[PDB]
Every structure is written in C-alpha cells, then in structure tokens.
From Swiss-Prot, chains A, B, C, D, E, F:
An individual GO BP term: intracellular iron ion homeostasis
Named cofactor requirement(s): Fe(2+); L-ascorbate
Pfam families named among the record's database cross-references: 2OG-FeII_Oxy_3, PKHD_C
Keyword set includes Oxidoreductase: yes
Note on how the cofactor is bound: Binds 1 Fe(2+) ion per subunit.
Domain Fe2OG dioxygenase: from-to ranges: 77-177
Protein name: PKHD-type hydroxylase PiuC
Entry keyword set: Dioxygenase, Iron, Metal-binding, Oxidoreductase, Vitamin C
HAMAP family attached to this UniProt entry: Hydroxyl_YbiX (MF_00657)
Keyword Ion transport in annotation: no
Top-level taxon in the UniProt lineage: Bacteria
EC number assigned by the record: 1.14.11.-
C-alpha cells in the first residue's frame, strides 16, 4: 500500500466536498455487475455527472504530474474516476474487482492492475467506513486524511466498513500500468529511488547514465502499451 | 472446436440469406495476399458493402451479448466480418491465416488468435463445402446448420472443400482474444463453468467470492489490452 | 509474511534451545560474502556442526510433512538450515540475500525464492533482536514465539536488531520453490484453501474434481523442476 | 492425441501379455491419492515388481530410440512405467493427474507434461475399457491395437470405462518434456517434419541448415533442463 | 545494425536537403527530458513544423512499403520522425533513449524497441558527426550515404560525434515493434528469408505452406498489438 | 562477442600446445552428427583422452574463478571442453550447434546457451583458421592470441576457415547459463559493472546495497536451476 498525500490542497478539498455534499446521488449498484452488487450498499454519482467528470479530470492532471504516482504506478490508462458516498449504514462488503473494466461500453477497457481511493472526507467526520484490504496473510485498514490517495494492487479482496455516523465522500478508480506484475513495478520503483539518490549525492558520475540505461531497458522489457 | 448454435433465429437467417442470394458478388482473391490467393477460388462481398457492414454489426452485437462466446473467446477485437459464397466448384484450398490482419489500411490490426465461421446456408442446400481443419495429429470437418457458429484457434491449417451443388453462404472473421494462448483460455473457460455450477448449487458460500477472485487474478495475469 | 506456528512442541524447543545454549559457536562472518559480512555481527554454528545437522534434519522432516508449509512454499529445494545466536549487542544490519546459494559438497544450488526463520528463544527472554523486513512502502518487524516459523519472499532487504539483554537463538534457511513468482504461489495457495473449504462443506460436488484439475494445470504451467 | 504404433512387435506383445496374465496383481488404490483412489477400481503391479521393472526398462529403451516419440514428446524425464489390469468390471473413473509425480528413491520428481498408455491387450479381446479423455469442448475415446501407444497432454481429465468382458492390460506413464507448453511442442514437431520432408526432396539447399538453426534456436528459447 | 539504403532517390534527397538547409531551426534540448538534455547540443525542427510533418509522412509511407524494413522491424508504431542538424561543433553525447516516448502529450506512446537514423547529408559534406553505438562488448560507428537508413535496437547507448566542418542533416525516430525481443525479431527475419529463398527455388512444395504456418504461429505467439 | 584474455599464462600455453602437438588425434566427424559431420573436416581428441580431460579440468578451474567469465556467462553447466586441430587445409564449414548436448557419462544435458573457443595457437603461426560467426546482419571473424577465450551466444551459424599453413589448436565448449536469454545476461553484466565502479568510487553509499538487491532480485526473477 502506497499512501500519496495532498493530491489536492485543503481549500481545494473543501470546495470539492461542498459540491459533493450538494450533489444528487444515485444508488451505487449501477456500476457493479450482478454479483458484487449484492455486496454494494452505497451511493454513487453517475459516471458522466458533470461534477464527476470535472473532478475526475482534475484528478488525472494532478496524478499525471505527481512524481510519486508516476513512478510507483507507471500509468498507461486511468479509468475515469468514480465518486461514492457511504452514509446511514452504507457499506461495500468484501469483493474482488473485475480484471477488465469497460469505459462507455468498451470504447476503452482498463486492466485493473492497481486500485485507488482518494479521500475527500476528514476521518473525524465519519465513524466506520474503513477501507479494509485482505491479502493472503493479513488485513490492512485504511482511513486517510482528506485529499490523500491510497494505491494498492488490484489483486486483493477489499471492502468498506459501514459508516455509522456522518458521511464519507471519496473518489475511486483503477489504473492499468505499463508494467502488469506488481513485483516488477516495485523493483523499478526501488531502483529509480536509488538512481535519484545517487544523482543528488554524486551527479555526473558515469555509472549513472548506464544505470539509467539499465532502468529503461527493464522498462523496455516489461512495458505493455 | 466450439460450436455455438443459433446466433440468429431461423427467420433472421432466411432474411439474411435472401439478401446474400441477391447481392452482387466479387472475386474472393481481393482479401488474400499473393500467397494464399493461389488457393482461394470463391466469391466475397467487398468489405464495406452495405450488407457486409450491416450483418457484420448485427453479428458483433449478438456475439458481444452471447455468454458462451464471451467466456470461450474473451474477445478484445473482432475483425469486421467478411462474407463469402462457394458455388459452381468454388473452394479455398489449405492455408494458414496471417497472424495480424489489418482493418482499413491498418487503422486497427487484429491478431488472429481465433477463427470463426457463421453458416448462413443449410447443410442440405449444398454438397461439399466442408470446413476442414487440420491440427498436428488429425483432421476435423465442420458443416453446421444455418445460424450456427464454429470457433477454433487461428493456429490451424484449414480449407473449404469445393461446392459441387447449390451454394454455401457464410460469414467469417477473426478474434483477437484478451488471452493469447489457447490453453490459458480453455483453463479460464473451464474454471468459469465450475464456478457457475457451484453458484447454482451452493450460492453465498464464502469460497465462491474467493474463487471468482482467483479467476479474475488469472485474467489480470494473462489479459493483454 | 506467513506465520507457521509450533513447528516443534514446547518441550522439544526447550531441549533444542538448551543444546544450543551449551554449543560452541563461531563468528558469523564466515558464511556471508565479504560485503554483507560488514553488516554481520552475530554468532553462528559451522555448517558441519553435528547439532546443526541434527536439528536441521528434524526441521526438514517436520516441514516436508507440514501441510501449511508445503502449500505456501511448494518447496523444491531447502538449503540446509543454519543456526545463529544474537547476544550482547550482536546484530545483523541490513542486507539482501544472494539469489543463488551453493550447498556445501557441490552439486546443489538453491535459488532463494523464500526466506525463513525458526525461532527457538522465547520473545520475553531477550530484548531487541527483531527481524526487520523492508518493503517498498513498508517495514515489518517479526519476533515470534519459540517454535514458530516465519516465511517471507527472498526479495526483501532485511536485518536483525541488536540483542541488548538475553540471547536470541534461531534457525534460518532458504527455499527454492516449484513456483518462482510470489504472486503465483499466493494465488495457488489461496485457491487450494478455497478448494479444501469446499471439499469439507460440499464433497462429491462435480466442480471439485474440475477445480482440482484447474489447480494442477496451473501448477503444470508454473512449476520449474 | 498422437498414436504411435508398434512399440513392440506382435510376438513381443504376446509374451508381455502372457507374463502379465500370470503375474500376481495388487489393488490399484495404492498409487493415487485419496481423491483419485475413490475413482480407482482396478488392479496394478507394485512399482518394485520385477516384471514391471523389466518391461518398463524395455519400453524406455524403445521410446528413447523412437524418432516419433522423441520429436513429439522431447522427453527430459519419463516416470517409471506402471502396469494395470482392468477386468471383471474394473474401472478408473474420471480423474486428473497430479502436476508433479515423485519417483521412488526421493531423488527425482516428474512434471506430468504428457500422459501415455501402451496397450498390451487386443481391443477385440475385451469389452469396454476405453480410455476416455475429456476436452474443453469434446470427448475422445481411445482403444488401440496391442503394442500401440497413445500420447496426450497431462492437462485433461480422463477415465477408463469398466471392462465387462475379458481383461485389459496396459502400461501407463508420464513424461516431463523439455518443452512445457503443448502448443510449443506441436509447433516444433510440425516444423521438424517439414524440415525432414524438405531434406528428402531438396537436400543441400542452403535454407535447410538455416531452418535447422531456427528449429534449434526455438529449442534453445523453450527447453527447460 | 541493419543498413537499408535508398529510402529516397538522389533527386528526392536533394530536394529534402534544400528545404532543410533553408528551414528555421530551433534548439534541440526541447525534446530531451531534463537528463539527456545536458548531452544534447544540436538543432532540431519543432515536431509539427510543416517540413517535419511532410517528410515524416513521406518517410512513413516509404517505410511501410519497404519489404526489408517491414520484415526486420515488424512495425506496430512509428514515432513521428524528428529532424536535426549538427553543425558548428554540434553534438549529442552518450545517452540512452527513454523506453516510452509520448506523442503530443500522450495521445499515442511508443515503446522504443528500435531506433533509426535516416541520413540526408552526404558523408563528404561534413566532418565528424558519426553515430556511435556502444554495445556491451564493442562500439560501432555509422556514417551512411544520404538517403540511407540505419536500424538498431533501442537498448544501446549511443551518441553523435561533434560536427567540425559543414553540416549534417538527418531524421531520427523510434519504432515499437510487434515483437519486443530483438532475438525474436531476428529469428523471424532469418526464417522469413529462408522461406523466401525456398519459394524461389522450389515453389509449390507442400512444406512451404507449413513453414509459413510456422512463421505465422510464431508471430501469433509473440506479437503484441 | 566477449574476449576474455589470458585464461592461461604464456608459459602454460606453450606447455599445453606442446602436448597437443605430440598427441594422437582422431577424425572430427565422430563427435558431430550427420549434416554437421558433412561440414566437419578437422581433427579432434576423443572425449576420454587423458590430455583432453586434464587440460579441460584446468580450464574449468580457471573459468569458475574468473570474475569476467562468471559475470558474463552466469554459468550453471559447462560441457566438458573438447579439443580440435585444424591443419593441412582442415576446416569446419557453416553449422549450428545442437540446442541440447548430452554429456557422455549420461545424466547431464547442457542447453547450449553460450559457445566458447580457447585459442592455444599463436595467430601468426597459422594461416586461415578464422572463427567466422554469422549474425543476422553481418559477419564477425575471430582469431585471438594464444591463451585467450571468445564467448558468444549459441544462436549463430559459425564456421572455421581452412588452415592453409601451420596448425591451429583450440578448445571449444558450451555453457548452459543460469540466465537463458542473452539480452538478460548482458543487462545483468552491464548492471554489475556499473555497481562495481560505484563501489570503488563511493563505497558505503546506501544506494549500493539497494542496487545490489535490485541485481539479485533480477537474478532471482531470471535464473533457472
């Protein structure tokens, strides 16, 4: 799990949450097939609601210009972000995301390599509502400050606990990475961090260009696009 | 070889075949390059003939909504269906399909993972014309009722026997699957039928969600798009 | 990080630890290459020590008959277990395990797909000594009850904190799995657990034999031996 | 499904069957696991039976000298052949073969890439006893002349129908190929046959040496050993 | 390195060079990210300069209809060709190309499997300016006649030596191949040349269709699109 | 083509060549199979020759302790070195090496990932005898000083030109690498050189241990053993 903070500033988050608080919400089951629909009991904006289209586009521009998201996710496709609200006991029980998610009836299709939640509500403003991620050998609970993003592989079973007080607004989306295998992405991420550290401490060292070549030749071997 | 019956109803097949019988046909060697053109001796509609465009689109809408085709083929791209007529001795001797088929000057290009024939003529309405498929260790002959589709891997050498009486009308196309390797697709197909059977017999069993998670993680590992 | 408890019984662990307390120890910088030897400040038994070979053989027999270890590790090769002691400030600073470890006497070489530590000391009897495993975006600290084993991928930088009070006795080793990729092993492990759960609940269901066939076909696709 | 005829001569087959007719048989439920032993209702020779070891060695010598078996199977390991008898209603209901079979003595483990049955009984001499191999979209039944072998991928559920009259004697085994994937083995097999055909027809052609290099380069890319 | 001569005729090269000589040149550092920009000291046309768009399109059509380029490169994407000029000491020190190059801010993104330079200056018309390609085990210097193309893998470190007299005009671009691995591309290229040679010497041989089938099944196995 | 000089000292080379000059030689066609034997017109020592086994063991001990050979070849298996003599017009026309070579004593089989020739004769002492290696787009000729080794991928057609004056003595062998793919091996080799250069210039840099971890994780991903 990668926590990427402050995608939006505090004033931006306040503006976005105010619009979400005043939006006309629809039943969340519309974007789930008949299976995980049994587990989904929240509210969602329609995909092409103008607020969802506007903030989704704003999220994409921020993420494509975030060095941490670019390095760790190596994004190729970002599914148009969806917006949900858990309140009044709303929840999303344990489910796996579909391997391929269609956009506008299959115009674009996104392999769900990575999943993400961007929190638009303060953790003090709702009870429950934790994003619970279950791996093979353990569980992780995530409840981040408003404006922060969590990034985790699409291979995990996850759920959102019921919200028992207040309301939780967030955006969620999937990313198809250039690099499908998470162990390969993390290897590239760690190697890039090492190269960045060496560039600061000892720039102009001839081994840096060759290690950069190694990094990009790995990307050549592994990138699908 | 997968036989998918009744893509169209009997009344629809009668309408489609009547239009095909009244269409203006061209020499089939147009679509074949100067290698398999020596083996191709049939009639074909031009690719953008309005009948070929109309029934091709109707064909895609039915196939995209057919659970058997969706599960077995896992389609990503469907080449715009071509339409042919074997009559008066027309035939297509043994040939292999090109690995990549270009659409409209290469705007889209389809890797020919799977081949398909949709029969529009009754088997009783023509002699010969069998679709003969030769794998490494044997041969299969296919002559299906009108409205039925045959699906088979693009890796095989195949031919159409001469038509010595009547006329054989059919559509043919290739599919680029999300999953390139046939053994991977069949594993996924078999797994899905097992999960479908368990959902019927014992729904809400907690292992069903996890096996569905397994299926989609395999699709996540194997899907190219 | 998989926790496999009670490899040995509490009585057995006491006998093993008592023997290790009376053993003659060697400087740990004899079995790590000169580089990781800079980070190594602990005690180790020589690989030809009879006590190390005796306990190591007992560990192998237990592990090769342990369903949890067999399923999660899918072992092909197990490097002969080594035994270390951390006491009086002894530690092992951060290091990466060599990808291929040669076994004394030639012949065998083990790809270090999985790492493991079997704890022989009670956690309350020593201070510090935690096994710290560095992830891409996380730290994990491990200090398990005596007789328990931790299994983790060999792809991680790890270390052992200094033991300030008491002594920490343990065995460590590496495993070459049939399945190299950790994401594949966990997928197989999860699938097997789901099948056992279904086998208990609804036996003789025809989907069990087919899903078992799916499991072994995946093992057939992925196993290297 | 590849049929390899006349591994042994007719005279040899009569001697082998006569010896097997006079041998002391054991219950077949001693070689397969619990799940498969439920489906197993036949007779088998113990793996240390001298007749099984003598005939099995004779099978290995013939198979390793057989150009057809060598090319289509590309064998790396052959599991020591086993011998069974189906008579008096004996059968082996549907089952899948374990992906990895351990050889007595502990040292060797065979990935079951390919399955094989060598028939020692005349098909006219017994009723039933068909080897039924279940495909994704088909069923294949095999009942071959005495002395003939069938070679087929280990990825299929298969069974043997009850023998209602007479007795069916056969040998079965598994092969770990150099080339794990069946589509790769068939590609190599077809390519080698084409080269041999060209070698007979137009020898000394400079493209023969280069295509042979292509064949071995593919074997270099795909062979695991 | 593949040398493909006479992409353009002598008269066409003269016309193109005259326009390049009269064009308004900009600093090259624009296309170089902040890294290789320290190594880039030449002149480039803006990407959408009408001369760059016109000749890039003209190169595009010539290459798509060139049998040597189609077979060796197996192109899927061609980055819109860039145009540079080295003069007055201009050079490009050692650098590695980025694995993924974006077109117009990411509408299309090209994996840089292959790199290419098309020379528009006569070697006699400038001093220095050699394209130097450093492999693991050696260096190659390329300085080709005007109108000729060089094709080489994108995995190499390369540079252009300073031009100390005259001026060097050229176009450069990258190609994403259908087949990512260079060893797979060369195997296909060599095998295609063998099949072409056999078709000339002995056409209508039944092994040619099967080897062509082998070639296309390899392309089916390896092509990404 | 990697050139590894001075496997033996000049004094050692003189003793080795002096022994080979006095040894009893055999027809080279006994080793190579037909087709390759058609192109083989040289002398070779039998594999049970004591001089071949003595020098061969000396080569193995030197190579296994040579950092350059260890890094570039990443050897898993080395085929017992063979010894040949070219003189009086003796030659070896173009040929590919078999992908899998069996070692005489049974048991071991070597995938011929890499080829090598150790020169025991001074290049001035014989005319001709060049080792010609044919690439996809070029030819390389090798005639190295006595005691030097050439290492090159096993994927190439190669030959030895006739020796018209003098005699050429050499040892040749194949290596199965831990890493099958040549592009992977060179990537690892280049990465290791970059790490070693950095280790000398800026030791104790925290990026060195992490980059070493990256190297071994790549080795963990790619090594087959």
């Amino acid at each position: 799990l990668l926590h990427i903070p402050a995608i939006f500033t505090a004033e931006e988050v306040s503006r976005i949450r105010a619009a979400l608080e005043q939006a006309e919400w629809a039943d969340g089951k519309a974007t789930a097939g008949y299976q995980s629909a049994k587990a989904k009991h929240n509210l969602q904006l329609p995909q092409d609601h103008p607020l969802a289209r506007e903030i989704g586009e704003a999220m994409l521009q921020r993420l494509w210009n975030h060095p941490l998201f670019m390095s760790a996710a190596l994004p190729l496709k970002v599914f148009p972000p969806l917006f949900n609200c858990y309140t009044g006991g709303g929840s999303f029980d344990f489910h796996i995301d579909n391997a391929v998610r269609d956009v506008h009836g299959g115009r674009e299709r996104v392999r769900t390599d990575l999943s993400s939640t961007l929190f638009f509500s303060d953790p003090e403003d709702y009870d429950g509502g934790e994003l619970v991620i279950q791996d093979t050998y353990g569980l992780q609970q995530v409840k981040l400050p408003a404006g922060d993003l969590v990034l985790y592989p699409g291979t995990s079973l996850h759920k959102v606990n019921p919200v028992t007080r207040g309301a939780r607004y967030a955006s969620f989306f999937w990313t198809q990475s250039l690099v499908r295998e998470d162990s390969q992405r993390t290897l590239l991420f760690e190697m890039d961090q090492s190269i960045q550290r060496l560039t600061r401490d000892v720039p102009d060292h001839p081994s840096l260009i060759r290690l950069t070549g190694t990094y990009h030749n790995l990307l050549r071997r592994w990138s699908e696009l």
